[PDB]
Design a protein around this ligand. Structure first.
Ligand SMILES: [Mg+2]
Ligand SMILES: [Zn+2]
Ligand SMILES: [Zn+2]
Lengths: 45, 68, 473, 101, 49, 33, 49, 335, 560
């Protein structure tokens, strides 16, 4: 599902539940979430 | 943030007249009035769109989160 | 404050001292060493005698002031020509400029705080000030350059009410966005347990159910989706048995989770753009999600005028209305001309004249205090372009086609959109606690009664003499 | 035949023709003014006035009032046929100037 | 006539104290406009005494 | 072109705010502390 | 007829809460006071409230 | 009433047309189609691809205002209505970027489309003769041949600035040959919709339908549609000399002129006058000039957005304003 | 500890907006709060045909209902979870539904700083678009509305008996007067006055292409009008502007409205000082109305709208009921809103600039008054002066300089109005009603004068002087609080500080006044509360102890 994004090196990493939540490349302590792969509908008005 | 596509009052497309304005500012050095006059718009409406506009996206793209 | 010393006939700061200052060296603190300027105190300038300008050199003088418009502060320097208005309309604007919304910082998309408002297309002001270039207000402006025909139109503008233009706010005049924060923490209780997150339950081919169709496989609201009423954007479950302290045993009782998620509630739907995981200081998980909502101007949203002429929106008027000044410029906001004599803001009237003649020969003008652009040579710029010297244009009415029998003052004014929209103030209650129409919980020392019936309102219905309305209410 | 486009209000009209009112739905100041001018040029019509009661609706109340021997339901049909004639005059003189140049 | 109502009350009596209090209120309001249709002032000057 | 005196005196205020800032009343106290 | 009808309708109707009307008709002009220093004297002889 | 009007220094008089039978004792100016066909005519100053300027004489303000009003609303046009996004990972939010795709003008004839019926479900409103699909797919890439310095985002960044030319029309449905003669393009391909950085990608799909300009500003077929009454300067007491040259420095240089080796000034090409009435504050030019404008003459100046030619917008407005009058006379008046 | 207290069900609070197309007895409620604020209706013989469709429409469609209470009290079953079409089919005769708020329902409407009894009126409802409590501006004067984003409260009564005690003796049409003085407090307002001064101006002459449109914009189409013969004939058929207000009072023969008052308007010029007619004035002046026909005079604030006992709607109210006065108020309020957008009215920088003649008199006459006060300064240090008996030698110098500097601002303030050209906005707004006086236009154009604080002039901010820009022992007017520049020319920094002090004085006396918005009126309410007139024409107390034998000595209602 591609669940993690580092806030410094921006490496597309992902790990499962309770697996030492940090970055496996740099070592930053906070992580972002990527945009979904589904389809969102908007109105151009 | 970015230059608007249409002007607010009448609706003339001013989004096509920003890069050609910045080209006339740096090279072929003119003041803002004449270089904005020989660019299209005659009215002071739709002239206000290019004159009083701050470009925030050039400063916003220095904080790119998808790279380092 | 630092002032300039004079020595018994004239100023110490000569012409040769100021040529070096704008050419690199000999800056400030190199004028304190050479004895040209000095700091004076409040009870120490009582033993002084200060001139205002340089055409005032009397041999009985001791000091000379640097600038007269230093008396206005940092927020108070946003007003163009403050010495033409009256002083309460210079004070109210100091409470309205801080409430205006716009660009906040260069990392305003990179931070998560509890509430901030943004502007989609901010524009720098037409007439600047010599004190707004130093505080860098022209890099992060908060407002919109409208075009204003000052006239009475459609009758929905009687006192403190502006009418707006459809097909002008449809093209991005006043589009804002509101970002709110929801934070949760996953507590580690003392009796060896956690509160876990998860979900993804289905029911008869629905993938997932209606209350769940904003969550991913993790259980957090993914970026890009929309959230509406009672749908859940953070699915949280806490253990129901490990609240007290049952001292640690190896019994299998940890499969008891009573779920208690957070639920979005609101009139109009929002969108999820950021969610962040943290492993904060004492090894404890933190979840911060941000929800943004794009709002457009409507009936009830208030605006200012950079002079204290605050007012609410009256009606969004069609574009085929709003008389059109034969070249073809439709006004953006029409303002009632009756707000001028009782409030005495004529410095606003100069703002159009130094604004309409500022657009033409491509120069953003200066409306600084005790100076700025002179009204004499700004009407000369306005008159050789083919316009009136006083900005009065003649209009052609929209609903009837014929001319208007008075020349109508037309030109651009830097307006600005405030807080205090109508979408988060509509609060209603039918019966019982936890009212059905709940406003956003940001009061901040502003409890103005609420949905109550005070003793002052009980005394009004005694004066009518109604006895059964008392028992009903 | 649309029976909801134009109506005739009951508690506004007198007897036998004269002093009638009409309610037209989904209309703005365009046909109101362009039809107020043509019916006023009928020399038997002496009170022709349109109005919109509320701006966030789509109503148009037009009142036609004569003296006599012309029913106002016929005075509306007379001033609505002449607008077709004016639009025939406008698009015929304009087309030949595009053609001839 | 003095401004002090109790000074009139200690010398003149009850009935001469209300006739001063219906005009001292009438004086402190007619110096600004704001007519308060003096039957209201007479009702105020009667419930106090 | 030509340097005046009543107009170039204005330039004392930028050169004041470049050396010591506008938020110096909070910075200088914590730096002295 | 007009002079008798406008007088017969002008009487105070029984049941009117006339204390509540008189209490609000006095206090509501009282809530629009600024300072307004005046004097019942000559050239600034006395400061009166 | 009191013909060609006067411009006063503090007001303007004679506003109402008032040419109806009932203005005076004699029944003057009836309808008389044979008189209106004789008196009304049209001149044309210029016709360009996106700008038209023409004149109408002997005609009321009311129906000319009607034409000016329903040039904007009732003339239909096409614009982007619904936008479907894929992985928008740029800095612009997906409501701001969706709002700028609707505002661009598309260059296609709107007579090739059908009106959307809103009572149908979502998979049945859109069909072949109803929808124009546009597709955008831009991914930014770092340019490997980097220059000697970081100068501008044009260099050292491949396709960092998207444009309106990147909206690729997809041939939808079945009839991919009806639009094969003229595929739909924007009226100006240089519209900066977004700025990008590497790692970012915009992928979307827009469904363009037909609509009127009174519903939203994006369906407006014309940028500016307006008129001006022809001004007129009736000069009397023919003064000359240094005052004649002072009389010239006020007005624009092509509305009055000084004769070369002969007598006083005159009026030439009064069409180019923008009325600023600055000769009404001198006290030298008080009873020596008479400003005004003629009420019958109209100068229509239309500048379109680029979807259709401006010589079609006026004819389509006359056709629309004709059709709503014949639609009303064929309806029963219901009590 | 004497705060608000009670919490009331079925209420809302929303900001307010302008709407003169709405009547004076109505408040337009949006369809988002008129869906949870219900009204309990008992079903009977005369509502079974409506409540069935009302139940069938449901809670989401706006003409619908939310809850339902059975006759035998099963539960309070809501119309949301099941219970479709068949529930409206039975509908026993004792059932109580809770219907949505609809058009014509009695609702009371409040502003939270309630001063007097005209702060809580009652209205009818009207269901509208966007979410604000818009209302007419003829009724905003008792609420003290200055709209600018102010919130107001809205309460619906929940029974059949309290709903009748709001629309009969508490609503808008029954409370056109204030009980404080009997004057009309709730009447025509700001832009409805200047729209009446421009129609009834003497230089306005209409025609059947314009008069018909004016008559059709005041009664939104449907009204039968009888066109009078014109005041001008055979050259040009012209109807005057005073024949429009002559026509909206009495449109046709069916209305019995005959109005026969006469009164003088605002600022008035004597005709010839010999002529016994009061209406031969140089201006328009004195107003004659004889049989619903205006013979002379414009319609400003004195004749039309809020003010004295000689109003037009006051005469209609005393003579021909409250409903006809309400109809005439609605008619003029929707006339002026349509007319003033088509006439055009602006102010601009042109209407504030002195025309090169006032500047010479300002340069001359002020320097005459500076010389006649500076001679008292050089006489003050010549020992003593002629001391006035009311004060000492120091306060007799303040009073004379204050009197001369108050006299200099009115002799300049009256030579500016005479050289001021007509057809401008602020002189018309000072000649007519709503806002602006001669003081405001003389303070914009000619001169601002003598910024005073706390009664006297400004004191010494430093030792022996006010500002450090003036010498010690300087009692000159430019040093001690006399500005001399108008707002068009621009203030000097000592003039700017002197104006800022006097502005912040009056600005702080308003913010602290909101803490004392009802403290005297509530304490006075403690005793004057339980007093009512009995049926023996005596006003008594609650314990029947008599307090006054007849009210005011004569028993007359000061309202009527
Ligand atoms: Mg307010
Ligand atoms: Zn990392
Ligand atoms: Zn424009």
């Amino acid at each position: 599902t591609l669940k993690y994004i580092c806030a410094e090196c921006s490496s597309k990493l992902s790990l499962s539940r309770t697996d030492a939540v940090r970055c496996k490349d740099c070592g930053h302590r906070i992580l972002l979430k990527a945009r979904t792969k589904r389809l969102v509908q908007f109105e151009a008005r | 943030m970015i230059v608007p596509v249409r002007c607010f009052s009448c609706g003339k497309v001013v989004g096509d007249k920003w890069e050609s304005y910045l080209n006339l500012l740096q090279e072929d050095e003119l003041d803002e009035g004449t270089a904005l006059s020989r660019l299209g718009l005659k009215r002071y409406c739709c002239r206000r769109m290019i004159l009083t506009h701050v470009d925030l996206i050039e400063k916003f793209l220095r904080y790119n989160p998808l790279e380092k | 404050r630092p002032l300039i010393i004079v020595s018994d006939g004239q100023s110490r700061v000569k012409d040769i001292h100021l040529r070096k200052l704008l050419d690199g060296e000999l800056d400030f603190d190199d004028f304190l060493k050479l004895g040209l300027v000095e700091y004076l105190d409040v009870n120490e300038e009582n033993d002084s005698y200060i001139a205002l300008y340089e055409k005032d050199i009397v041999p009985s003088m001791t000091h000379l002031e640097i600038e007269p418009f230093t008396i206005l502060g940092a927020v108070a320097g946003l007003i163009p020509y403050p010495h033409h208005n009256q002083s309460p309309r210079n004070t109210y604007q100091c409470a309205m400029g801080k409430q205006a919304i716009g660009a906040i910082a260069y990392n305003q998309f990179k931070r998560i705080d509890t509430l901030l408002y943004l502007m989609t297309y901010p524009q720098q002001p037409m007439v600047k000030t010599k004190t707004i270039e130093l505080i860098d207000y022209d890099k992060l402006p908060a407002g919109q350059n409208a075009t204003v025909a000052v006239m009475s139109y459609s009758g929905y503008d009687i006192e403190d009410a502006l009418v707006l233009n459809k097909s002008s706010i449809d093209r991005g005049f006043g589009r804002c966005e509101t970002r709110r924060k929801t934070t949760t923490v996953l507590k580690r209780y003392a009796n060896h347990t956690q509160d876990i997150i998860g979900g993804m339950r289905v029911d008869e081919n629905g993938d997932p159910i209606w209350q769940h169709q904003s969550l991913g496989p993790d259980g957090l609201g993914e970026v890009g989706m929309k959230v509406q009423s009672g749908q859940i954007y953070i699915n949280k479950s806490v253990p129901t048995n490990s609240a007290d302290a049952p001292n640690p045993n190896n019994v299998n009782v940890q499969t008891q989770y009573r779920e208690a998620p957070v639920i979005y509630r609101g009139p109009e739907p929002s969108h999820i753009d950021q969610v962040m995981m943290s492993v904060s200081d004492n090894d404890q998980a933190l979840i911060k999600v941000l929800l943004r909502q794009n709002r457009r101007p409507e009936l009830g949203d208030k605006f200012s005028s950079r002079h204290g002429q605050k007012g609410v929106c009256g009606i969004i008027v069609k574009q085929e209305d709003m008389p059109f000044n034969d070249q073809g410029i439709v006004p953006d906001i029409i303002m009632n001309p009756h707000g001028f004599p009782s409030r005495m803001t004529v410095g606003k009237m100069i703002e159009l004249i130094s604004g309409k003649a500022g657009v033409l020969n491509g120069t953003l003008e200066y409306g600084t205090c005790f100076g700025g652009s002179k009204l004499e040579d700004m009407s000369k710029i306005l008159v050789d372009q083919g316009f009136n010297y006083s900005g009065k244009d003649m209009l052609y009415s929209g609903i009837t086609g014929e001319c208007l029998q008075a020349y109508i003052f037309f030109g651009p004014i830097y307006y600005q959109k405030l807080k205090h929209m109508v979408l988060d103030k509509m609060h209603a209650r039918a019966r019982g606690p936890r009212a059905v129409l709940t406003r956003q919980p940001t009061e901040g020392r502003s409890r103005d009664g609420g949905l109550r019936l005070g003793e002052m309102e009980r005394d009004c219905v005694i004066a009518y003499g109604a006895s059964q309305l008392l028992l009903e209410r | 035949p649309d029976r909801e486009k134009i109506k005739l209000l009951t508690q506004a009209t007198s007897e036998d023709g004269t002093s009638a009112s009409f309610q037209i739905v989904e209309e703005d100041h365009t046909l109101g003014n362009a039809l107020r001018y043509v019916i006023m040029k009928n020399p038997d019509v002496e009170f022709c006035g349109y109005s919109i009661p509320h701006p966030s609706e789509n109503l148009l109340n037009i009142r036609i009032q004569t003296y006599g021997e012309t029913t106002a339901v016929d005075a509306l049909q007379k001033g609505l046929k002449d607008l077709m004639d004016l639009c025939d005059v406008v698009e015929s003189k304009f087309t030949e100037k595009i053609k001839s140049m | 006539t003095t401004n002090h109502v109790l000074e009139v009350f200690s010398v003149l009596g009850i009935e001469a104290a209300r006739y001063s209090i219906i005009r001292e209120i009438n004086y402190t309001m007619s110096n600004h406009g704001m007519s308060v249709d003096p039957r209201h002032i007479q009702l105020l000057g009667d419930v106090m005494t | 072109d030509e340097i005046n005196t009543a107009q170039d005196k204005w330039h004392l205020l930028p050169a004041f705010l470049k050396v010591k800032g506008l938020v110096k009343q909070h910075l200088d106290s914590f730096n002295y502390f | 007829e007009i002079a008798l009808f406008k007088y017969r309708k002008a009487r105070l109707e029984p049941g009117t809460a006339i204390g509540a009307i008189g209490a609000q008709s006095i206090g509501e002009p009282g809530t629009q006071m600024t300072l307004k220093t005046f004097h019942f004297a000559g050239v600034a002889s006395m400061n009166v409230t | 009433m009191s013909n060609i009007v006067g411009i006063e220094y503090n007001r303007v008089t004679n506003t109402t047309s008032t040419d109806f039978p009932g203005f005076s004792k004699d029944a003057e100016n009836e309808w008389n189609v044979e008189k209106f066909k004789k008196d009304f005519e049209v001149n044309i100053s210029s016709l360009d691809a996106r700008e038209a300027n023409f004149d109408l004489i002997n005609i009321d303000t009311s129906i000319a205002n009607a034409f000016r009003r329903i040039m904007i609303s009732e003339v239909p046009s096409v614009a982007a209505e619904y936008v479907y996004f894929f992985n928008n990972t740029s800095v612009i939010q997906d409501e701001v970027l969706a709002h700028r795709i609707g505002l661009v003008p598309l260059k296609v004839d709107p007579d090739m489309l059908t009106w959307v019926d809103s009572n149908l479900p979502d998979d049945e409103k859109f069909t072949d003769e109803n929808t124009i699909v546009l597709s955008l797919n831009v991914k930014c890439t770092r340019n490997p041949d980097a220059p000697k310095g970081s100068t501008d985002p044009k260099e050292l960044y491949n396709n960092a600035h998207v444009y309106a030319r990147d909206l690729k029309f997809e041939p939808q449905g079945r009839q991919s040959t009806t639009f094969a003669d003229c595929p739909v393009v924007p009226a100006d391909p240089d519209i900066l919709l977004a700025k990008l950085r590497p790692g970012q990608e915009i992928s979307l799909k827009a469904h363009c339908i037909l609509g009127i300009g009174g519903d939203h500003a994006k369906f407006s077929p014309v940028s500016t549609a307006s008129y001006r009454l022809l001004p007129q300067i009736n000069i009397l007491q023919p003064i000359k000399g240094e005052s004649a040259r002072r009389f010239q420095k006020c007005f624009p240089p092509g509305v009055i002129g000084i004769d070369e080796g002969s007598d006083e000034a005159y009026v030439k090409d009064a069409r180019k006058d923008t009325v600023s009435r600055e000769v009404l504050r001198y006290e030298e030019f008080a009873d020596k000039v008479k400003l005004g404008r003629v009420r019958n003459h109209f100068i229509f100046n239309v500048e379109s957005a680029g979807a259709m030619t401006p010589e079609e917008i006026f004819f389509k407005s006359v056709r629309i304003l004709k059709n709503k009058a014949e639609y009303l006379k064929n309806c029963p008046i219901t009590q | 500890g004497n705060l608000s207290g009670k919490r009331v069900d079925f209420s809302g609070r929303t900001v307010i907006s302008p709407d003169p197309n709405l009547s004076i007895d109505e408040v337009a409620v949006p369809d988002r709060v008129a869906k949870v604020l219900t009204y309990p209706e008992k079903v009977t013989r005369y509502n079974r045909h409506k409540l069935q469709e009302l139940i069938v429409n449901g809670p989401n469609v706006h003409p619908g209902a939310n809850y339902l209470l059975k006759r035998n009290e099963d539960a309070r079953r809501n119309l949301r979870y099941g219970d479709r079409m068949k529930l409206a089919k039975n509908l026993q005769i004792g059932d109580v539904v809770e219907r949505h708020l609809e058009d014509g329902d009695v609702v009371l409407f409040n502003r939270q700083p309630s001063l007097h009894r005209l702060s809580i009126l009652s209205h009818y409802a009207k269901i509208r678009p966007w979410r604000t409590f818009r209302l007419n501006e003829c009724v905003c004067t008792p609420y003290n509305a200055d709209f600018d984003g102010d919130e107001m409260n809205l309460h619906v009564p929940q029974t059949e008996e309290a709903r009748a005690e709001a629309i009969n003796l508490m609503g808008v049409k029954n409370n056109l007067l204030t009980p404080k003085s009997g004057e009309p407090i709730i009447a025509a307002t700001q832009d409805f006055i200047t729209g009446s001064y421009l129609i009834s101006h003497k230089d306005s002459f209409y025609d059947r292409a314009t008069l018909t449109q004016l008559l059709s914009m005041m009664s939104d189409g449907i009204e039968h009008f009888d066109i009078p013969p014109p005041a001008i004939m055979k050259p040009y058929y012209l109807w005057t502007g005073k024949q429009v207000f002559s026509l909206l009072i009495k449109p046709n023969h069916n209305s019995p409205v005959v109005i026969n008052l006469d009164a003088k308007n605002k600022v008035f010029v004597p005709p010839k000082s010999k002529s016994l007619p009061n209406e031969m004035s140089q201006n328009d002046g004195f107003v004659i109305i004889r049989g619903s026909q205006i013979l002379s005079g414009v319609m400003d604030k004195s004749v039309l709208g809020d003010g004295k006992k000689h109003s037009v709607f006051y005469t209609i109210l005393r003579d021909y009921g409250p409903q006809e006065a309400a109809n005439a108020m609605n008619r003029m309020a929707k006339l002026c809103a349509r007319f003033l957008g088509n006439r055009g009215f602006s102010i601009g920088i042109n209407d504030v600039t002195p025309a090169d003649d006032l500047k010479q008199k300002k340069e001359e006459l002020v320097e005459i008054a500076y010389h006649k006060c500076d001679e008292l300064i050089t006489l003050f240090n010549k020992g003593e002066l002629e001391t006035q008996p009311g004060c000492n030698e120091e306060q007799t110098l303040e009073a004379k300089i204050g009197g001369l500097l108050s006299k200099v601002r009115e002799e300049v303030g009256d030579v500016c109005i005479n050289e001021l050209d007509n057809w401008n906005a602020p002189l018309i707004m000072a000649t007519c009603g709503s806002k602006g006086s001669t003081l405001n236009v003389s303070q914009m154009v000619a001169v601002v004068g003598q910024q005073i604080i706390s009664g006297n002039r400004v004191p010494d901010g430093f030792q022996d002087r006010s500002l450090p820009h003036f010498p010690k022992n300087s009692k000159t007017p430019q040093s001690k609080g006399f500005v001399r520049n108008s707002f068009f020319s621009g203030l000097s920094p000592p003039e700017f500080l002197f104006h800022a002090i006097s502005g912040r004085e009056g600005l702080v006396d308003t913010a602290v006044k909101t803490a004392e918005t009802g403290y005297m009126s509530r304490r006075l309410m403690k005793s004057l509360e339980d007093l009512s007139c009995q049926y023996d024409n005596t006003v008594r107390t609650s314990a029947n102890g008599i307090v006054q034998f007849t009210y005011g000595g004569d028993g007359l209602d000061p309202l009527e």
